[PDB]
Specification:
The protein is of the alpha+beta class. It has a single domain, classed as Cytochrome P450 (Cytochrome p450, Orthogonal Bundle), CATH 1.10.630. It has 16 helices and ten strands. The strands form three sheets. Strands 1-2-8-5-3 form a five-stranded mixed beta sheet. Strand 6 and strand 7 form a beta hairpin. Helix 6 packs antiparallel against helix 7. The relative contact order is 0.17. Bound molecules: protoporphyrin IX containing FE (HEM) and the ligand C[C@@H](c1nc(-c2ccc(C#N)cc2)cs1)[C@](O)(Cn1cncn1)c1cc(F)ccc1F. Protoporphyrin IX containing FE (HEM) binds next to helix 3, helix 9, helix 10 and helix 16.
Length: 413
């Protein structure tokens, strides 16, 4: 090894990792001509679709990111937040006087519910959820670690996936054709943002696949990440170790705001919950949901005295580059308040769990707001104690959340 950087050769290709905040500089800051996403992420293509995201050429690609970006902008966010909150308050109402809950599975149910209404609209969410929660998890199920190198191996799962996507397109066929018949009616969701999107040089719009694809992707990104970091934020907090040292800090801020921005719950009020923003952010720092992020190298680049040829595949791990102790004092242990003047730091790419650069996470705030809302509600309506100790990371999966007896128990407030 070096400490900072280390290539392997595995199967065919050779994987050049980076860990340094200096290291990251080439991974997070060169451009689309210099690093490619095409090859490394090509596993997703026939989960999302043809000419969707990584499916499409560079021209049609950069624009779809933009439609997503604008679908998830501060504007559109402010308008989802109402939906996000209500669902949260609606979900946690249903709970008992007192009882156990697998916080992973519960917040997974709850985020997909809200992922439905913001991404696919009222009709999908009100009429068709249980259908579209199957048609998703059938696409999901066609993601095996084989799929990441042969994403078209004729194996039975891939068929079922390809099949389930086709079906989901025809579902939005109906819903979009309905809407294109009454332009009159205004619409608050992503798919509307997409429906109204058009490319440069052409004014026919995106179609009932391309759209559906674009939305599924955001379904994917939601379920594979928010869902877990949601759970981590709380598993860590309500471990007793940390409940003592941090939970007063927390609930004080829950009251301090409560008496200013009311019993009801609005974005203004989330945006300034600066503690819980950190108390979540630290659960990304310690247990990022994506293990690592990849590019094939196009224009080659030296790093120090280490040459990184062409056809390489440069990695960065969140989980690795955020346990560096020359960058995070006390990295082994759960310190929400580290960010209070870490966030004051100048050097780029010290925190990478939401990546950085040209391709940093277009969902960052959506995630936060979804997540903060969940605990924001859960703190006010319950008292939350952990059963067992802090769950172990679960690498036996494509998704990388906490191991599956990862539960709490609630008693009403
Ligand atoms: C805690 C939750 C999440 C985490 C940790 C996370 C993390 C990341 C990271 C690390 C990247 C960079 C990946 C790369 O370099 O290729 C990224 C990109 C992205 N994320 Fe997320 N993400 C989260 C949630 C979401 C959600 C909920 C959405 C959408 C609803 C979303 C949409 C995206 C998109 C569109 C990009 C691509 C930007 C591009 O390729 O130019 N993410 N995310
Ligand atoms: C492109 C998507 C990514 N997949 C990985 C990845 C996952 C598992 C392995 C393995 N083995 C290797 C790489 C890193 S980034 C993703 O980056 C992921 N995402 C972003 N925010 C939330 N999840 C992605 C990007 C999108 F633009 C849309 C959907 C989507 F899942």
């Amino acid at each position: 090894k070096y400490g900072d950087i280390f290539t392997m050769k595995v199967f065919g290709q050779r994987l050049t990792f980076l860990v340094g905040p200096d290291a990251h500089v080439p991974f997070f800051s060169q451009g689309d001509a210099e690093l490619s996403q095409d090859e490394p992420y090509q596993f997703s293509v026939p989960i999302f679709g043809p000419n969707v995201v990584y499916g499409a050429d560079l021209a049609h690609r950069n624009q779809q990111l933009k439609f997503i970006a604008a679908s998830l902008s501060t504007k559109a966010l402010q308008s989802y937040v109402p939906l996000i909150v209500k669902e949260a308050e609606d979900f946690f109402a249903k709970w008992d006087k007192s009882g156990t809950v697998d916080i992973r599975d519960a917040l997974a149910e709850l985020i997909i519910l809200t992922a439905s209404r913001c991404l696919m609209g009222k009709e999908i969410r009100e009429n068709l959820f249980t259908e579209v929660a199957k048609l998703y998890q059938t696409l999901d199920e066609g993601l095996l670690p084989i799929s990441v190198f042969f994403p078209y191996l004729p194996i039975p799962a891939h068929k079922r996936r390809d099949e389930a996507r086709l079906a989901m397109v025809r579902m939005f066929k109906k819903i979009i054709d309905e809407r294109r018949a009454n332009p009159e009616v205004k619409h608050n969701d992503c798919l509307q943002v997409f429906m109204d999107a058009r490319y440069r040089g052409e004014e026919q719009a995106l179609n009932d696949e391309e759209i559906t694809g674009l939305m599924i992707a955001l379904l994917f990104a939601g379920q594979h990440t928010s869902s877990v970091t949601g759970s981590w934020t709380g598993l860590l907090l309500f471990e007793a170790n940390n409940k003592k040292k941090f939970l007063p800090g927390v609930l004080e801020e829950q009251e301090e705001i409560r008496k200013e921005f009311g019993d009801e719950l609005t974005m203004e009020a989330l945006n300034k919950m600066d503690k819980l923003h950190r108390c979540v952010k630290e659960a990304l720092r310690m247990y990022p949901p994506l293990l690592f992020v990849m590019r094939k190298v196009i224009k080659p680049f030296s790093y120090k005295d280490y040459y990184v040829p062409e056809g390489d595949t440069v990695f960065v791990s969140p989980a690795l580059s955020m346990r560096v102790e020359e960058v995070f004092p006390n990295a082994d242990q759960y310190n929400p308040e580290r960010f209070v003047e870490e966030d004051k730091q100048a050097q780029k790419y010290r925190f990478v769990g939401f990546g950085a650069g040209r391709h940093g996470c277009m969902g960052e705030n959506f995630a936060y707001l979804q997540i903060k809302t969940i605990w924001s509600v859960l703190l006010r309506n319950f008292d939350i104690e952990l059963v067992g100790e802090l769950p172990k990371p679960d690498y036996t999966a494509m998704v990388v959340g906490p191991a599956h007896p990862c539960l709490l128990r609630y008693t009403r407030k």
